[PDB]
Amino acid sequence: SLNAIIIDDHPLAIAAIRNLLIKNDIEILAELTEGGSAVQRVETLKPDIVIIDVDIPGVNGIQVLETLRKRQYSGIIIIVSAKFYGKHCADAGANGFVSKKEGMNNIIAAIEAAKNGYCYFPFSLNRFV
Amino acid sequence: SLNAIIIDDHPLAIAAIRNLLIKNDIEILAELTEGGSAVQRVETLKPDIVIIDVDIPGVNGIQVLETLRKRQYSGIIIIVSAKDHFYGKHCADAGANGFVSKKEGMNNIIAAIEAAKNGYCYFPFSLN
């Protein structure tokens, strides 16, 4: 089974994401509710997947993503948001960015995409049409 | 059921893509083997999905994508390639919903279509 760390301070989403991962044969190594300890916990526990909520207190979510990549973390990072900011997360080296409002199916799709070598980010047709 | 057009001249991939779409309750409105008629067939048949091989003869496949977006086609366009780590950024900049290598199998094409139905796009990742 793949291993994950959940980095999110929102009670409802924490429970939903934990239940989603366990249903999909992914083990949870740790759950964090702030960003201050995140880079160290990831470096110690060596998860395959890190899910990072954009509004984590302490060290900010995107900063955690940037620092993990800078420090050569090679695993799957999916950014989640309670609600345009996908592009920045893509440029910062996330494997996906998922809005939690549309449910949990998108987080598991993003992890699947990432395992397959693909990224999973919001699409805006208005940029092109 | 959603509808699709397949634009690919490679016999083996045509069959594999068609069987994959069928299996997933997607109807095939047309199958094209060149890019010259592509924009016209798409505008007339009005598919939800267009699958375009990068090596399609005639009008080049990425050009077909660009022209369809210029002409306000609002459906799902997935670019496919027989091979490569590199094409995908350009396909994303041109307005595709995804770019997938056919080498690793059909599962990525249906994942890309499902991503696009959900409002997401599906492109190769490089950590490099």
mmCIF file of all heavy atoms in Angstrom, chain A residues 6-21 31 51 53 80-82 100-101 104 107:
data_model
loop_
_atom_site.group_PDB
_atom_site.id
_atom_site.type_symbol
_atom_site.label_atom_id
_atom_site.label_comp_id
_atom_site.label_asym_id
_atom_site.label_seq_id
_atom_site.Cartn_x
_atom_site.Cartn_y
_atom_site.Cartn_z
ATOM 1 N N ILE A 6 -1.568 13.634 5.720
ATOM 2 C CA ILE A 6 -2.616 14.621 5.527
ATOM 3 C C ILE A 6 -2.253 15.893 6.279
ATOM 4 O O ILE A 6 -2.004 15.841 7.500
ATOM 5 C CB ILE A 6 -3.995 14.142 6.038
ATOM 6 C CG1 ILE A 6 -4.416 12.878 5.299
ATOM 7 C CG2 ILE A 6 -5.085 15.246 5.849
ATOM 8 C CD1 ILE A 6 -5.590 12.199 5.925
ATOM 9 N N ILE A 7 -2.199 17.025 5.580
ATOM 10 C CA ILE A 7 -1.827 18.306 6.226
ATOM 11 C C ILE A 7 -2.997 19.247 5.993
ATOM 12 O O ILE A 7 -3.142 19.876 4.930
ATOM 13 C CB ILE A 7 -0.536 18.892 5.679
ATOM 14 C CG1 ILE A 7 0.590 17.851 5.705
ATOM 15 C CG2 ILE A 7 -0.095 20.158 6.457
ATOM 16 C CD1 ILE A 7 1.930 18.348 5.164
ATOM 17 N N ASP A 8 -3.883 19.307 6.998
ATOM 18 C CA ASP A 8 -5.159 20.053 6.858
ATOM 19 C C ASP A 8 -5.660 20.290 8.272
ATOM 20 O O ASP A 8 -5.633 19.373 9.108
ATOM 21 C CB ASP A 8 -6.154 19.198 6.068
ATOM 22 C CG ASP A 8 -7.358 19.969 5.560
ATOM 23 O OD1 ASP A 8 -7.740 20.997 6.174
ATOM 24 O OD2 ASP A 8 -7.936 19.547 4.536
ATOM 25 N N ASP A 9 -6.098 21.506 8.565
ATOM 26 C CA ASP A 9 -6.651 21.786 9.900
ATOM 27 C C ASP A 9 -8.171 21.765 9.976
ATOM 28 O O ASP A 9 -8.740 22.029 11.041
ATOM 29 C CB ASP A 9 -6.080 23.070 10.556
ATOM 30 C CG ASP A 9 -6.679 24.367 10.000
ATOM 31 O OD1 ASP A 9 -7.212 24.367 8.884
ATOM 32 O OD2 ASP A 9 -6.570 25.420 10.716
ATOM 33 N N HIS A 10 -8.847 21.439 8.882
ATOM 34 C CA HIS A 10 -10.300 21.508 8.879
ATOM 35 C C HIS A 10 -10.899 20.167 9.299
ATOM 36 O O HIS A 10 -10.813 19.177 8.551
ATOM 37 C CB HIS A 10 -10.848 21.850 7.477
ATOM 38 C CG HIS A 10 -10.380 23.157 6.915
ATOM 39 N ND1 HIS A 10 -9.224 23.260 6.165
ATOM 40 C CD2 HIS A 10 -10.954 24.384 6.904
ATOM 41 C CE1 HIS A 10 -9.090 24.504 5.738
ATOM 42 N NE2 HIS A 10 -10.130 25.208 6.166
ATOM 43 N N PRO A 11 -11.575 20.116 10.467
ATOM 44 C CA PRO A 11 -12.124 18.861 10.966
ATOM 45 C C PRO A 11 -12.919 18.034 9.950
ATOM 46 O O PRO A 11 -12.728 16.787 9.848
ATOM 47 C CB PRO A 11 -13.010 19.345 12.144
ATOM 48 C CG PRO A 11 -12.247 20.508 12.681
ATOM 49 C CD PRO A 11 -11.723 21.212 11.450
ATOM 50 N N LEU A 12 -13.834 18.637 9.203
ATOM 51 C CA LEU A 12 -14.708 17.818 8.352
ATOM 52 C C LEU A 12 -13.898 17.204 7.239
ATOM 53 O O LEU A 12 -14.023 16.004 6.949
ATOM 54 C CB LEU A 12 -15.910 18.632 7.833
ATOM 55 C CG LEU A 12 -17.195 17.837 7.786
ATOM 56 C CD1 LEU A 12 -17.490 17.618 9.224
ATOM 57 C CD2 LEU A 12 -18.308 18.646 7.140
ATOM 58 N N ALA A 13 -13.045 18.017 6.601
ATOM 59 C CA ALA A 13 -12.240 17.509 5.498
ATOM 60 C C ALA A 13 -11.225 16.487 5.953
ATOM 61 O O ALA A 13 -10.904 15.546 5.208
ATOM 62 C CB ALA A 13 -11.488 18.690 4.831
ATOM 63 N N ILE A 14 -10.648 16.670 7.144
ATOM 64 C CA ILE A 14 -9.726 15.667 7.679
ATOM 65 C C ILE A 14 -10.365 14.293 7.706
ATOM 66 O O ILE A 14 -9.757 13.310 7.246
ATOM 67 C CB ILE A 14 -9.217 16.028 9.081
ATOM 68 C CG1 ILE A 14 -8.357 17.304 8.993
ATOM 69 C CG2 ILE A 14 -8.381 14.904 9.696
ATOM 70 C CD1 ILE A 14 -8.141 17.998 10.373
ATOM 71 N N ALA A 15 -11.569 14.226 8.248
ATOM 72 C CA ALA A 15 -12.270 12.951 8.347
ATOM 73 C C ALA A 15 -12.608 12.397 6.962
ATOM 74 O O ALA A 15 -12.426 11.189 6.722
ATOM 75 C CB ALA A 15 -13.520 13.111 9.176
ATOM 76 N N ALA A 16 -13.066 13.262 6.054
ATOM 77 C CA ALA A 16 -13.453 12.802 4.712
ATOM 78 C C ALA A 16 -12.239 12.278 3.963
ATOM 79 O O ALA A 16 -12.324 11.254 3.248
ATOM 80 C CB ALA A 16 -14.140 13.923 3.921
ATOM 81 N N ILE A 17 -11.128 13.007 4.066
ATOM 82 C CA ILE A 17 -9.928 12.560 3.328
ATOM 83 C C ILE A 17 -9.367 11.263 3.915
ATOM 84 O O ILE A 17 -8.968 10.343 3.155
ATOM 85 C CB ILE A 17 -8.877 13.704 3.330
ATOM 86 C CG1 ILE A 17 -9.370 14.880 2.501
ATOM 87 C CG2 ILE A 17 -7.492 13.237 2.749
ATOM 88 C CD1 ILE A 17 -8.568 16.160 2.657
ATOM 89 N N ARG A 18 -9.347 11.159 5.251
ATOM 90 C CA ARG A 18 -8.864 9.935 5.909
ATOM 91 C C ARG A 18 -9.721 8.740 5.461
ATOM 92 O O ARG A 18 -9.155 7.734 5.007
ATOM 93 C CB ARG A 18 -8.946 10.114 7.422
ATOM 94 C CG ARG A 18 -8.531 8.898 8.237
ATOM 95 C CD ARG A 18 -9.036 8.962 9.641
ATOM 96 N NE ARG A 18 -8.567 10.144 10.340
ATOM 97 C CZ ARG A 18 -9.344 10.964 11.030
ATOM 98 N NH1 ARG A 18 -10.658 10.758 11.100
ATOM 99 N NH2 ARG A 18 -8.788 11.993 11.645
ATOM 100 N N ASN A 19 -11.037 8.902 5.457
ATOM 101 C CA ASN A 19 -11.907 7.781 5.068
ATOM 102 C C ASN A 19 -11.711 7.430 3.605
ATOM 103 O O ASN A 19 -11.733 6.248 3.209
ATOM 104 C CB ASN A 19 -13.376 8.131 5.384
ATOM 105 C CG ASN A 19 -13.635 8.228 6.875
ATOM 106 O OD1 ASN A 19 -12.966 7.583 7.665
ATOM 107 N ND2 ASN A 19 -14.610 9.054 7.264
ATOM 108 N N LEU A 20 -11.439 8.440 2.785
ATOM 109 C CA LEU A 20 -11.243 8.207 1.339
ATOM 110 C C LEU A 20 -9.971 7.401 1.110
ATOM 111 O O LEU A 20 -9.968 6.400 0.352
ATOM 112 C CB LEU A 20 -11.159 9.536 0.605
ATOM 113 C CG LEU A 20 -10.763 9.479 -0.859
ATOM 114 C CD1 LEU A 20 -11.935 9.028 -1.712
ATOM 115 C CD2 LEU A 20 -10.234 10.868 -1.293
ATOM 116 N N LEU A 21 -8.901 7.782 1.799
ATOM 117 C CA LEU A 21 -7.615 7.088 1.620
ATOM 118 C C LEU A 21 -7.701 5.632 2.075
ATOM 119 O O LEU A 21 -7.254 4.711 1.376
ATOM 120 C CB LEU A 21 -6.499 7.816 2.384
ATOM 121 C CG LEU A 21 -6.150 9.197 1.807
ATOM 122 C CD1 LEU A 21 -5.019 9.824 2.558
ATOM 123 C CD2 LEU A 21 -5.824 9.128 0.343
ATOM 124 N N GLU A 31 -1.122 12.778 10.501
ATOM 125 C CA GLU A 31 -2.029 13.882 10.208
ATOM 126 C C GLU A 31 -1.519 15.123 10.941
ATOM 127 O O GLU A 31 -1.277 15.094 12.156
ATOM 128 C CB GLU A 31 -3.434 13.552 10.669
ATOM 129 C CG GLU A 31 -3.993 12.315 10.007
ATOM 130 C CD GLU A 31 -5.406 11.965 10.440
ATOM 131 O OE1 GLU A 31 -6.001 12.698 11.271
ATOM 132 O OE2 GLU A 31 -5.937 10.947 9.933
ATOM 133 N N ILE A 51 -0.897 15.338 1.150
ATOM 134 C CA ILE A 51 -2.036 16.202 0.786
ATOM 135 C C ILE A 51 -1.969 17.470 1.635
ATOM 136 O O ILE A 51 -1.858 17.389 2.864
ATOM 137 C CB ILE A 51 -3.370 15.445 0.957
ATOM 138 C CG1 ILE A 51 -3.336 14.152 0.136
ATOM 139 C CG2 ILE A 51 -4.563 16.362 0.620
ATOM 140 C CD1 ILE A 51 -4.338 13.118 0.634
ATOM 141 N N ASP A 53 -3.524 21.249 2.458
ATOM 142 C CA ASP A 53 -4.577 22.251 2.321
ATOM 143 C C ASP A 53 -3.940 23.641 2.203
ATOM 144 O O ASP A 53 -3.012 23.957 2.969
ATOM 145 C CB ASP A 53 -5.534 22.196 3.512
ATOM 146 C CG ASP A 53 -6.601 23.278 3.435
ATOM 147 O OD1 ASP A 53 -7.599 23.093 2.693
ATOM 148 O OD2 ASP A 53 -6.397 24.360 4.070
ATOM 149 N N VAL A 80 -4.994 20.901 -1.827
ATOM 150 C CA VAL A 80 -6.466 20.947 -1.756
ATOM 151 C C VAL A 80 -6.922 22.303 -1.244
ATOM 152 O O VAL A 80 -6.184 22.971 -0.520
ATOM 153 C CB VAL A 80 -7.067 19.761 -0.946
ATOM 154 C CG1 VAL A 80 -6.617 18.427 -1.550
ATOM 155 C CG2 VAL A 80 -6.611 19.808 0.509
ATOM 156 N N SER A 81 -8.101 22.721 -1.690
ATOM 157 C CA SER A 81 -8.630 24.024 -1.281
ATOM 158 C C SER A 81 -10.125 23.883 -1.018
ATOM 159 O O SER A 81 -10.801 23.120 -1.707
ATOM 160 C CB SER A 81 -8.418 25.056 -2.362
ATOM 161 O OG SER A 81 -8.953 26.312 -1.957
ATOM 162 N N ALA A 82 -10.631 24.625 -0.029
ATOM 163 C CA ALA A 82 -12.046 24.558 0.314
ATOM 164 C C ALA A 82 -12.925 25.045 -0.843
ATOM 165 O O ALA A 82 -14.034 24.551 -1.022
ATOM 166 C CB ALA A 82 -12.324 25.331 1.592
ATOM 167 N N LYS A 100 -12.093 21.045 -2.814
ATOM 168 C CA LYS A 100 -12.805 20.052 -1.950
ATOM 169 C C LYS A 100 -14.322 20.174 -2.055
ATOM 170 O O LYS A 100 -15.040 19.239 -1.671
ATOM 171 C CB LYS A 100 -12.376 20.145 -0.451
ATOM 172 C CG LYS A 100 -10.973 19.584 -0.169
ATOM 173 C CD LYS A 100 -10.542 19.612 1.314
ATOM 174 C CE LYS A 100 -10.002 20.969 1.702
ATOM 175 N NZ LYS A 100 -9.664 21.239 3.186
ATOM 176 N N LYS A 101 -14.792 21.294 -2.595
ATOM 177 C CA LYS A 101 -16.246 21.571 -2.678
ATOM 178 C C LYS A 101 -16.977 20.535 -3.546
ATOM 179 O O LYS A 101 -18.105 20.131 -3.235
ATOM 180 C CB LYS A 101 -16.451 22.981 -3.223
ATOM 181 C CG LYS A 101 -17.898 23.423 -3.345
ATOM 182 C CD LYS A 101 -18.109 24.130 -4.655
ATOM 183 C CE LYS A 101 -19.363 23.594 -5.339
ATOM 184 N NZ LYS A 101 -19.191 23.480 -6.809
ATOM 185 N N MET A 104 -14.868 14.147 -2.832
ATOM 186 C CA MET A 104 -13.610 13.435 -2.609
ATOM 187 C C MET A 104 -13.124 12.668 -3.817
ATOM 188 O O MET A 104 -11.930 12.313 -3.895
ATOM 189 C CB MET A 104 -13.759 12.468 -1.429
ATOM 190 C CG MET A 104 -13.916 13.158 -0.062
ATOM 191 S SD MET A 104 -12.385 13.923 0.561
ATOM 192 C CE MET A 104 -12.702 15.710 0.519
ATOM 193 N N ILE A 107 -9.938 13.980 -5.368
ATOM 194 C CA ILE A 107 -8.611 13.757 -4.718
ATOM 195 C C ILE A 107 -8.037 12.388 -5.078
ATOM 196 O O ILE A 107 -6.845 12.254 -5.405
ATOM 197 C CB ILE A 107 -8.648 13.931 -3.147
ATOM 198 C CG1 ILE A 107 -9.005 15.394 -2.801
ATOM 199 C CG2 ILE A 107 -7.308 13.442 -2.449
ATOM 200 C CD1 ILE A 107 -9.301 15.606 -1.306
#
